[PDB]
Ligand binder design. Structure first.
Ligand SMILES: OCCCCCCCC[C@H](O)CO
Ligand SMILES: OCCCCCCCC[C@H](O)CO
Ligand SMILES: OCCCCCCCC[C@H](O)CO
Ligand SMILES: [Zn+2]
Ligand SMILES: [Zn+2]
Lengths: 154, 154
């Protein structure tokens, strides 16, 4: 179905960016790329949350998109949430030049992420290996710095 | 599959609101309701535009969602864009208490509006009866006051 999507990330602080999605083949991987600025240098959790609901800020996006009811993992684990895209890295200028390819999210079908929320988080995603309960839910990535609803793009 | 959706409308000016969508059956109408404030009193065109793309503000949402390549109409017309939801009315306090039921838009299938952009416009939508070229495209509803990407709601 849909082959391109886009997300404008905004929040209460300086974090903002534009993230593109492209899926040339409905049964193939999604390319995810763009630039997020205003970030502290280092790793930031980067997840699709379940609801494209921004009525109370990023909070109402709910938890990670998890249609298979699995535990949080890194994108390369079999045990992952569908929304588990891992970390993005911001450089010393505060910019994350995102470049991710993922074969679990989709722009169509039951793993469709259109109309859900992309969130860039305060802290690193421990990829579910943090040894606490929070690790298996959010990877301890902390608060939601910026988010946007993922929309169909031209 | 999706039975509820939500949209947060923001723009460069004071217009803002929250619009809810509910479709209990996929073969059935979508209820559209909520409140938009900061509007001038009177009629305002209220349309789903094609792209859930807010990268350059409301302008990048593209034209009215129109997968059947029809001319613009009011919601009651057989000739209408899928995104043609007519006018909403703002009271003397600047508030549009939206209450619409439509069976052309859907929260699934070909006519799915999740991941697309809801826009409230400057002027009245002439429902395609204005007799100029613009009426058959936008209803002469004028600029985009506020918009948001339609997202899956809990
Ligand atoms: O993806 C490449 C450009 C992304 C960086 C642009 C900063 C954010 C601009 C606004 O949020 C978009 O309305
Ligand atoms: O939605 C109920 C009213 C529909 C009729 C709106 C007429 C707008 C005419 C304006 O002068 C167009 O330039
Ligand atoms: O867009 C065209 C449909 C609405 C046309 C209604 C015009 C109202 C005329 C009245 O005489 C105003 O005093
Ligand atoms: Zn997760
Ligand atoms: Zn139209």
């Amino acid at each position: 179905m849909a082959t391109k999507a886009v997300c404008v990330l905004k929040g209460d602080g300086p974090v903002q960016g534009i993230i593109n999605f492209e899926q040339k083949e409905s049964n193939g991987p999604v390319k995810v790329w763009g630039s997020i600025k205003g970030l502290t240098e280092g790793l930031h959790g980067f997840h699709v949350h379940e609801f494209g609901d921004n009525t109370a800020g990023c909070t109402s996006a709910g938890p990670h998109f998890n249609p298979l009811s699995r535990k949080h993992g890194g994108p390369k684990d079999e045990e992952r949430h569908v929304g588990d895209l891992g970390n993005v890295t911001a450089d010393k200028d505060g910019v994350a030049d995102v470049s991710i390819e993922d074969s679990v999210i989709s722009l169509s079908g039951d793993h469709c992420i259109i109309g859900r929320t992309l969130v860039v988080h305060e802290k690193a995603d421990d990829l579910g290996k943090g040894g606490n309960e929070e690790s298996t839910k959010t990877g301890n990535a902390g608060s939601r710095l910026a988010c946007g609803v993922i929309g169909i793009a031209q």
